[PDB]
Amino acid sequence: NRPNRLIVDEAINEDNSVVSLSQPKMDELQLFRGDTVLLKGKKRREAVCIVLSDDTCSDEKIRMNRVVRNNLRVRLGDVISIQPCPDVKYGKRIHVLPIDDTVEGITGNLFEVYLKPYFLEAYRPIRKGDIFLVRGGMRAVEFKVVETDPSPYCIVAPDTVIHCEGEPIKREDEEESLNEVGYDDIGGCRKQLAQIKEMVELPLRHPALFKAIGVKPPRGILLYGPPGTGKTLIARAVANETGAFFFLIN
Amino acid sequence: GPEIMSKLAGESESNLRKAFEEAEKNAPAIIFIDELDAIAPKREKTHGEVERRIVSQLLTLMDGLKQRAHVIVMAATNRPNSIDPALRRFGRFDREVDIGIPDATGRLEILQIHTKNMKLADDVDLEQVANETHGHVGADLAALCSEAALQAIRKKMDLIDLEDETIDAEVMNSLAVTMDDFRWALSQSNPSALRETVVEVPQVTWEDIGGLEDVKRELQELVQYPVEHPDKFLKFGMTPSKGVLFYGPPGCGKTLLAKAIANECQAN
């Protein structure tokens, strides 16, 4: 079944350009302490990150945040193929452009505020088509890698000239908003989310299974607690993270 | 409030819809609901279907606030437990401000505002009147000045009697209100205002209590320090005392002490 195909799990490191693996798994896959890896998933897409060692991670799982998660167009549970890519060299010049619905209200030098401190000696491996998120200035601004000189993939060095043409782009169909809800936007509900997820994981991710198997899944789940805990926030997070449809009834 | 409940069942929700609709277009704006208690007392007084539907209409409108449209909804009531708890939900009426009756300083401040147009005499001491209005609200103090003004009126041009649609200014400018006029107003049955739990700052110092310097410094360590030196308590790690019990024979200034220590901290 190829020991290089792993499953995307929740992330401990919320950094955009990091993929956490277990110690014995990197010994089987021949990965180093900073080797740029290449991820492949559904809808035929690629992404480049940096592999690190995670003690809390399991052998058959890989930790990654919603940024890398959305770039591969996959959800928690999908299959991805990781492989070593040592032919990735440094970048020269990189032309990137921001999204219109994430700059509404602010203007000026975006390079000095967001871009420069973000790539400040971080050596972040970006690729043409990737959509990364930079937080700062008490908000969040999304950028999409339009074109890089060392096509397709290259590493952003602190000497690499970063160009900003200043032209807002349209929002594509399958591009889920990173401003929306997710499992990484709710806290305090540890065991709550633990119970909730494993109750609605299988029936939502594979309806075919339950229509084939003679096992009854829970139909109705009730949420207790005082107002203000974020009841609605939890529910919408599951739907946005499982890809399932969401219809609210006030 | 009653304006909405006066409209027939159906036109009621229409007016509420039009209210938010008209105010949202005129942004920025402030939507003020008067007698909210008459609209949403959803507990035991929610007896019927018509009432519940009206409340929900407002609830939808409260949630219907798109936020980017800049309107703020204010309301008033007699007491917190009059309003429907569904409106207390953190997302609609989230901020709450308790505006109880004014204190001694409060009533004094109000009296000057209601007497800003009338010619007060020299013997008139508004500070004195504010202190002896044991349980008076803003409106009752107004009626106090009004009935006292009528007393000052029924002694001047009343003897002259000028039946006209316009009073001369020289006659009115010369008119003044005496301290006795305020005495007569207080003497009547009209200062009978509602009396509640009075929360005020004691106008009594330590000088009303002879000696006992030991309990003074003791009390200061208990209340003055954890407010004027909160950093010091965190420096040493100890936790402030939550209370003290006064014991002894009656009429030794136990009440006076408790007031005096609040006076030192200038607290309520």
Tab-separated table of all heavy atoms in Angstrom, chain B residues 161-208:
chain	number	residue	atom	x	y	z
B	161	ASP	N	-53.236	90.045	39.091
B	161	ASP	CA	-54.059	89.291	38.145
B	161	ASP	C	-54.079	89.933	36.757
B	161	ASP	O	-54.892	90.815	36.480
B	161	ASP	CB	-55.484	89.112	38.683
B	161	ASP	CG	-56.228	87.973	38.009
B	161	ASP	OD1	-55.776	87.503	36.943
B	161	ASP	OD2	-57.269	87.545	38.549
B	162	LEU	N	-53.186	89.474	35.886
B	162	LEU	CA	-53.138	89.960	34.513
B	162	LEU	C	-53.607	88.902	33.519
B	162	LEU	O	-52.801	88.133	32.995
B	162	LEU	CB	-51.724	90.423	34.158
B	162	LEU	CG	-51.213	91.652	34.911
B	162	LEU	CD1	-49.824	92.038	34.428
B	162	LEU	CD2	-52.180	92.816	34.758
B	163	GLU	N	-54.912	88.862	33.267
B	163	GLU	CA	-55.480	87.881	32.350
B	163	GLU	C	-55.038	88.170	30.919
B	163	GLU	O	-55.706	88.906	30.191
B	163	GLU	CB	-57.007	87.885	32.438
B	163	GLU	CG	-57.555	87.527	33.809
B	163	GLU	CD	-59.027	87.855	33.952
B	163	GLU	OE1	-59.564	88.579	33.088
B	163	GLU	OE2	-59.651	87.382	34.926
B	164	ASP	N	-53.913	87.585	30.517
B	164	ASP	CA	-53.379	87.793	29.174
B	164	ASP	C	-52.741	86.524	28.615
B	164	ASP	O	-52.437	85.589	29.356
B	164	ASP	CB	-52.348	88.923	29.177
B	164	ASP	CG	-52.948	90.262	29.557
B	164	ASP	OD1	-53.515	90.934	28.670
B	164	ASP	OD2	-52.853	90.642	30.743
B	165	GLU	N	-52.543	86.502	27.300
B	165	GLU	CA	-51.883	85.382	26.640
B	165	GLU	C	-50.370	85.576	26.619
B	165	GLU	O	-49.631	84.713	26.143
B	165	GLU	CB	-52.409	85.209	25.214
B	165	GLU	CG	-53.855	84.744	25.135
B	165	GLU	CD	-54.209	84.167	23.778
B	165	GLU	OE1	-53.284	83.920	22.975
B	165	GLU	OE2	-55.412	83.960	23.513
B	166	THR	N	-49.914	86.713	27.136
B	166	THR	CA	-48.485	86.997	27.208
B	166	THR	C	-48.119	87.826	28.441
B	166	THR	O	-48.541	88.973	28.586
B	166	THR	CB	-47.983	87.706	25.933
B	166	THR	OG1	-46.718	88.327	26.194
B	166	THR	CG2	-48.978	88.764	25.474
B	167	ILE	N	-47.331	87.224	29.327
B	167	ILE	CA	-46.896	87.875	30.558
B	167	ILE	C	-45.703	88.801	30.320
B	167	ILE	O	-44.802	88.479	29.544
B	167	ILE	CB	-46.533	86.837	31.642
B	167	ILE	CG1	-47.620	85.762	31.734
B	167	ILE	CG2	-46.337	87.509	32.992
B	167	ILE	CD1	-48.986	86.305	32.091
B	168	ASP	N	-45.705	89.952	30.988
B	168	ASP	CA	-44.624	90.924	30.856
B	168	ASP	C	-43.342	90.376	31.476
B	168	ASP	O	-43.386	89.623	32.449
B	168	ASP	CB	-45.014	92.247	31.516
B	168	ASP	CG	-43.994	93.342	31.274
B	168	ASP	OD1	-44.022	93.951	30.184
B	168	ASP	OD2	-43.165	93.593	32.173
B	169	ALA	N	-42.200	90.758	30.912
B	169	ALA	CA	-40.915	90.202	31.329
B	169	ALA	C	-40.395	90.819	32.626
B	169	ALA	O	-39.768	90.135	33.435
B	169	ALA	CB	-39.885	90.359	30.218
B	170	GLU	N	-40.648	92.111	32.815
B	170	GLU	CA	-40.212	92.809	34.021
B	170	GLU	C	-40.852	92.199	35.263
B	170	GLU	O	-40.230	92.124	36.322
B	170	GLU	CB	-40.544	94.301	33.939
B	170	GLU	CG	-39.686	95.078	32.954
B	170	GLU	CD	-38.455	95.681	33.606
B	170	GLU	OE1	-37.791	94.978	34.396
B	170	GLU	OE2	-38.145	96.856	33.319
B	171	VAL	N	-42.099	91.765	35.119
B	171	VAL	CA	-42.829	91.142	36.215
B	171	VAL	C	-42.210	89.798	36.580
B	171	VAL	O	-42.101	89.450	37.756
B	171	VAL	CB	-44.313	90.936	35.852
B	171	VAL	CG1	-45.096	90.457	37.064
B	171	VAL	CG2	-44.908	92.223	35.301
B	172	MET	N	-41.801	89.045	35.564
B	172	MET	CA	-41.250	87.712	35.777
B	172	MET	C	-39.802	87.736	36.255
B	172	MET	O	-39.385	86.884	37.040
B	172	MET	CB	-41.360	86.878	34.497
B	172	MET	CG	-42.785	86.673	34.005
B	172	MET	SD	-43.526	85.097	34.492
B	172	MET	CE	-42.221	84.353	35.470
B	173	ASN	N	-39.037	88.714	35.781
B	173	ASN	CA	-37.633	88.827	36.157
B	173	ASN	C	-37.470	89.207	37.625
B	173	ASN	O	-36.506	88.808	38.277
B	173	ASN	CB	-36.913	89.838	35.261
B	173	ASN	CG	-35.418	89.881	35.516
B	173	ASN	OD1	-34.655	89.104	34.942
B	173	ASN	ND2	-34.992	90.793	36.382
B	174	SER	N	-38.424	89.979	38.135
B	174	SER	CA	-38.400	90.421	39.525
B	174	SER	C	-38.820	89.310	40.483
B	174	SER	O	-38.499	89.352	41.670
B	174	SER	CB	-39.300	91.644	39.711
B	174	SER	OG	-40.653	91.328	39.436
B	175	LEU	N	-39.544	88.324	39.962
B	175	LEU	CA	-40.028	87.216	40.779
B	175	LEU	C	-38.875	86.350	41.278
B	175	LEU	O	-37.957	86.026	40.524
B	175	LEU	CB	-41.033	86.371	39.989
B	175	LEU	CG	-41.863	85.327	40.746
B	175	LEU	CD1	-43.239	85.196	40.115
B	175	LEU	CD2	-41.166	83.974	40.770
B	176	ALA	N	-38.932	85.980	42.553
B	176	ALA	CA	-37.915	85.124	43.152
B	176	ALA	C	-38.542	84.065	44.054
B	176	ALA	O	-39.648	84.245	44.563
B	176	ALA	CB	-36.911	85.958	43.931
B	177	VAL	N	-37.828	82.961	44.246
B	177	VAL	CA	-38.307	81.868	45.083
B	177	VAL	C	-37.509	81.811	46.381
B	177	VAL	O	-36.279	81.825	46.359
B	177	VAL	CB	-38.204	80.515	44.356
B	177	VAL	CG1	-38.711	79.390	45.246
B	177	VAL	CG2	-38.981	80.560	43.050
B	178	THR	N	-38.210	81.756	47.508
B	178	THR	CA	-37.553	81.735	48.811
B	178	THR	C	-37.356	80.310	49.324
B	178	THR	O	-37.879	79.355	48.750
B	178	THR	CB	-38.359	82.531	49.858
B	178	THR	OG1	-39.654	81.940	50.020
B	178	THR	CG2	-38.519	83.979	49.420
B	179	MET	N	-36.595	80.177	50.407
B	179	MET	CA	-36.345	78.877	51.018
B	179	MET	C	-37.625	78.308	51.620
B	179	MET	O	-37.821	77.092	51.657
B	179	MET	CB	-35.261	78.990	52.092
B	179	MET	CG	-34.841	77.659	52.697
B	179	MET	SD	-33.968	76.601	51.528
B	179	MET	CE	-33.442	75.270	52.605
B	180	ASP	N	-38.497	79.197	52.087
B	180	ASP	CA	-39.758	78.793	52.698
B	180	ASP	C	-40.695	78.179	51.664
B	180	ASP	O	-41.539	77.346	51.996
B	180	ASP	CB	-40.428	79.983	53.388
B	180	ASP	CG	-41.741	79.610	54.050
B	180	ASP	OD1	-41.707	79.003	55.141
B	180	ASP	OD2	-42.806	79.923	53.479
B	181	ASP	N	-40.549	78.601	50.412
B	181	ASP	CA	-41.345	78.044	49.325
B	181	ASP	C	-40.982	76.578	49.113
B	181	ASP	O	-41.847	75.748	48.833
B	181	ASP	CB	-41.142	78.842	48.036
B	181	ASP	CG	-41.612	80.278	48.159
B	181	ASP	OD1	-42.607	80.519	48.876
B	181	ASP	OD2	-40.990	81.167	47.539
B	182	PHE	N	-39.696	76.267	49.247
B	182	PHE	CA	-39.231	74.889	49.160
B	182	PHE	C	-39.681	74.111	50.390
B	182	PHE	O	-39.905	72.902	50.325
B	182	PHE	CB	-37.707	74.838	49.034
B	182	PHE	CG	-37.196	75.229	47.678
B	182	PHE	CD1	-35.902	75.687	47.511
B	182	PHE	CD2	-38.012	75.133	46.566
B	182	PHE	CE1	-35.436	76.043	46.260
B	182	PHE	CE2	-37.552	75.490	45.314
B	182	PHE	CZ	-36.261	75.946	45.161
B	183	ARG	N	-39.809	74.814	51.511
B	183	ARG	CA	-40.277	74.208	52.751
B	183	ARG	C	-41.723	73.756	52.591
B	183	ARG	O	-42.097	72.663	53.016
B	183	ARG	CB	-40.156	75.195	53.915
B	183	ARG	CG	-40.528	74.615	55.270
B	183	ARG	CD	-39.505	73.592	55.732
B	183	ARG	NE	-38.161	74.161	55.787
B	183	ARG	CZ	-37.053	73.496	55.473
B	183	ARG	NH1	-37.124	72.232	55.081
B	183	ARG	NH2	-35.874	74.096	55.554
B	184	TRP	N	-42.529	74.613	51.973
B	184	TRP	CA	-43.944	74.338	51.762
B	184	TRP	C	-44.156	73.172	50.800
B	184	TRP	O	-45.086	72.381	50.963
B	184	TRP	CB	-44.660	75.593	51.254
B	184	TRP	CG	-46.113	75.393	50.963
B	184	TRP	CD1	-47.148	75.507	51.844
B	184	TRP	CD2	-46.697	75.060	49.698
B	184	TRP	NE1	-48.340	75.257	51.208
B	184	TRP	CE2	-48.090	74.981	49.889
B	184	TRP	CE3	-46.175	74.818	48.424
B	184	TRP	CZ2	-48.968	74.669	48.854
B	184	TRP	CZ3	-47.048	74.509	47.398
B	184	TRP	CH2	-48.429	74.437	47.620
B	185	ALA	N	-43.288	73.073	49.798
B	185	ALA	CA	-43.370	71.995	48.820
B	185	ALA	C	-43.043	70.647	49.455
B	185	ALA	O	-43.695	69.641	49.170
B	185	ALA	CB	-42.443	72.275	47.647
B	186	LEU	N	-42.030	70.634	50.316
B	186	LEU	CA	-41.647	69.425	51.039
B	186	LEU	C	-42.700	69.045	52.073
B	186	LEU	O	-42.885	67.868	52.381
B	186	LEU	CB	-40.292	69.615	51.723
B	186	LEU	CG	-39.067	69.724	50.815
B	186	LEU	CD1	-37.870	70.244	51.593
B	186	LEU	CD2	-38.753	68.374	50.192
B	187	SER	N	-43.382	70.051	52.607
B	187	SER	CA	-44.392	69.837	53.636
B	187	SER	C	-45.627	69.134	53.082
B	187	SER	O	-46.356	68.468	53.818
B	187	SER	CB	-44.789	71.168	54.282
B	187	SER	OG	-43.664	71.814	54.851
B	188	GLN	N	-45.855	69.281	51.781
B	188	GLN	CA	-47.014	68.680	51.133
B	188	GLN	C	-46.825	67.169	50.987
B	188	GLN	O	-45.841	66.612	51.471
B	188	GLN	CB	-47.251	69.330	49.766
B	188	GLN	CG	-48.710	69.393	49.324
B	188	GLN	CD	-49.485	70.511	49.998
B	188	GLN	OE1	-49.477	70.644	51.222
B	188	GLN	NE2	-50.164	71.323	49.196
B	189	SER	N	-47.769	66.511	50.320
B	189	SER	CA	-47.714	65.062	50.146
B	189	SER	C	-47.080	64.657	48.816
B	189	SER	O	-46.945	63.469	48.526
B	189	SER	CB	-49.116	64.459	50.258
B	189	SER	OG	-49.683	64.721	51.530
B	190	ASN	N	-46.694	65.644	48.012
B	190	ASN	CA	-46.058	65.370	46.721
B	190	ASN	C	-44.593	64.879	46.714
B	190	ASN	O	-44.170	64.258	45.738
B	190	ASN	CB	-46.237	66.546	45.749
B	190	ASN	CG	-45.513	67.799	46.198
B	190	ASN	OD1	-45.601	68.200	47.356
B	190	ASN	ND2	-44.789	68.423	45.277
B	191	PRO	N	-43.809	65.148	47.781
B	191	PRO	CA	-42.474	64.538	47.738
B	191	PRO	C	-42.490	63.038	48.032
B	191	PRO	O	-41.428	62.416	48.089
B	191	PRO	CB	-41.712	65.284	48.839
B	191	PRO	CG	-42.756	65.754	49.767
B	191	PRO	CD	-43.928	66.096	48.905
B	192	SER	N	-43.678	62.470	48.217
B	192	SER	CA	-43.825	61.038	48.462
B	192	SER	C	-43.356	60.206	47.271
B	192	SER	O	-44.169	59.671	46.515
B	192	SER	CB	-45.278	60.697	48.797
B	192	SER	OG	-46.168	61.291	47.869
B	193	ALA	N	-42.042	60.105	47.108
B	193	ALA	CA	-41.456	59.321	46.029
B	193	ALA	C	-41.087	57.930	46.532
B	193	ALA	O	-40.928	57.719	47.734
B	193	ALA	CB	-40.234	60.023	45.474
B	194	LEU	N	-40.960	56.985	45.605
B	194	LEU	CA	-40.615	55.606	45.944
B	194	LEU	C	-39.264	55.514	46.648
B	194	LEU	O	-38.300	56.173	46.257
B	194	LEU	CB	-40.615	54.731	44.688
B	194	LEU	CG	-41.797	54.927	43.736
B	194	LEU	CD1	-41.613	54.105	42.470
B	194	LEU	CD2	-43.108	54.578	44.426
B	195	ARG	N	-39.204	54.692	47.692
B	195	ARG	CA	-37.988	54.537	48.482
B	195	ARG	C	-37.387	53.142	48.333
B	195	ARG	O	-38.035	52.137	48.629
B	195	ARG	CB	-38.266	54.837	49.957
B	195	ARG	CG	-38.667	56.276	50.237
B	195	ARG	CD	-38.315	56.683	51.659
B	195	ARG	NE	-36.880	56.607	51.915
B	195	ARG	CZ	-36.297	57.009	53.040
B	195	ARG	NH1	-37.027	57.520	54.021
B	195	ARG	NH2	-34.983	56.902	53.184
B	196	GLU	N	-36.143	53.090	47.867
B	196	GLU	CA	-35.446	51.826	47.664
B	196	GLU	C	-34.176	51.745	48.500
B	196	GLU	O	-33.958	52.554	49.403
B	196	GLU	CB	-35.082	51.646	46.190
B	196	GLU	CG	-36.262	51.423	45.268
B	196	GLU	CD	-35.834	51.284	43.821
B	196	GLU	OE1	-34.626	51.076	43.576
B	196	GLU	OE2	-36.701	51.382	42.928
B	197	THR	N	-33.341	50.758	48.191
B	197	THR	CA	-32.044	50.605	48.840
B	197	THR	C	-31.091	51.706	48.392
B	197	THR	O	-30.688	51.753	47.229
B	197	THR	CB	-31.415	49.237	48.524
B	197	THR	OG1	-31.205	49.118	47.111
B	197	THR	CG2	-32.324	48.110	48.992
B	198	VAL	N	-30.734	52.592	49.316
B	198	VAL	CA	-29.903	53.744	48.982
B	198	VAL	C	-28.415	53.403	48.977
B	198	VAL	O	-27.843	53.055	50.010
B	198	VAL	CB	-30.146	54.917	49.951
B	198	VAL	CG1	-29.234	56.086	49.609
B	198	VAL	CG2	-31.606	55.342	49.915
B	199	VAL	N	-27.793	53.508	47.806
B	199	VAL	CA	-26.356	53.308	47.681
B	199	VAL	C	-25.668	54.647	47.448
B	199	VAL	O	-25.740	55.207	46.354
B	199	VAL	CB	-26.018	52.360	46.519
B	199	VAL	CG1	-24.518	52.105	46.460
B	199	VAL	CG2	-26.781	51.053	46.664
B	200	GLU	N	-25.001	55.159	48.477
B	200	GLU	CA	-24.375	56.473	48.395
B	200	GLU	C	-23.031	56.528	49.112
B	200	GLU	O	-22.620	55.567	49.761
B	200	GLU	CB	-25.309	57.546	48.960
B	200	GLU	CG	-25.513	57.460	50.463
B	200	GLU	CD	-26.303	58.634	51.010
B	200	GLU	OE1	-26.386	59.671	50.319
B	200	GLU	OE2	-26.838	58.518	52.132
B	201	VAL	N	-22.354	57.665	48.985
B	201	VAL	CA	-21.101	57.901	49.690
B	201	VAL	C	-21.375	58.672	50.977
B	201	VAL	O	-21.941	59.764	50.937
B	201	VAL	CB	-20.109	58.699	48.825
B	201	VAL	CG1	-18.781	58.863	49.552
B	201	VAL	CG2	-19.911	58.017	47.479
B	202	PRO	N	-20.981	58.096	52.123
B	202	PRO	CA	-21.221	58.683	53.446
B	202	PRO	C	-20.635	60.085	53.583
B	202	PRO	O	-19.463	60.295	53.273
B	202	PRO	CB	-20.488	57.723	54.389
B	202	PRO	CG	-20.467	56.429	53.660
B	202	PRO	CD	-20.304	56.791	52.215
B	203	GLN	N	-21.448	61.029	54.047
B	203	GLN	CA	-20.992	62.399	54.254
B	203	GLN	C	-20.553	62.602	55.700
B	203	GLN	O	-20.645	63.704	56.244
B	203	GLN	CB	-22.082	63.408	53.872
B	203	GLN	CG	-23.381	63.289	54.663
B	203	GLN	CD	-24.308	62.211	54.129
B	203	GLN	OE1	-23.925	61.047	54.011
B	203	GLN	NE2	-25.535	62.597	53.801
B	204	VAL	N	-20.067	61.528	56.313
B	204	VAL	CA	-19.619	61.558	57.699
B	204	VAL	C	-18.167	61.098	57.817
B	204	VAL	O	-17.813	60.001	57.384
B	204	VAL	CB	-20.528	60.701	58.609
B	204	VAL	CG1	-20.873	59.379	57.935
B	204	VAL	CG2	-19.874	60.474	59.963
B	205	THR	N	-17.329	61.949	58.399
B	205	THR	CA	-15.910	61.646	58.544
B	205	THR	C	-15.604	60.967	59.874
B	205	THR	O	-16.510	60.553	60.597
B	205	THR	CB	-15.051	62.919	58.429
B	205	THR	OG1	-15.379	63.817	59.496
B	205	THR	CG2	-15.298	63.610	57.097
B	206	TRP	N	-14.318	60.859	60.189
B	206	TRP	CA	-13.872	60.233	61.427
B	206	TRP	C	-14.076	61.168	62.612
B	206	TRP	O	-14.102	60.732	63.762
B	206	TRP	CB	-12.394	59.853	61.326
B	206	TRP	CG	-12.072	58.958	60.170
B	206	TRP	CD1	-11.764	59.344	58.898
B	206	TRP	CD2	-12.014	57.528	60.181
B	206	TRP	NE1	-11.524	58.241	58.114
B	206	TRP	CE2	-11.669	57.114	58.879
B	206	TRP	CE3	-12.221	56.555	61.164
B	206	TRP	CZ2	-11.528	55.771	58.535
B	206	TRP	CZ3	-12.080	55.223	60.820
B	206	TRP	CH2	-11.737	54.844	59.517
B	207	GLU	N	-14.222	62.458	62.321
B	207	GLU	CA	-14.364	63.479	63.356
B	207	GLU	C	-15.675	63.353	64.132
B	207	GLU	O	-15.836	63.956	65.193
B	207	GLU	CB	-14.235	64.878	62.748
B	207	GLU	CG	-12.864	65.166	62.157
B	207	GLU	CD	-12.798	66.511	61.463
B	207	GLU	OE1	-13.625	67.389	61.784
B	207	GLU	OE2	-11.916	66.691	60.596
B	208	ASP	N	-16.605	62.568	63.599
B	208	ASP	CA	-17.869	62.314	64.277
B	208	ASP	C	-17.706	61.189	65.292
B	208	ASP	O	-18.619	60.896	66.064
B	208	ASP	CB	-18.963	61.962	63.267
B	208	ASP	CG	-19.166	63.046	62.227
B	208	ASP	OD1	-18.349	63.131	61.287
B	208	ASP	OD2	-20.143	63.814	62.351
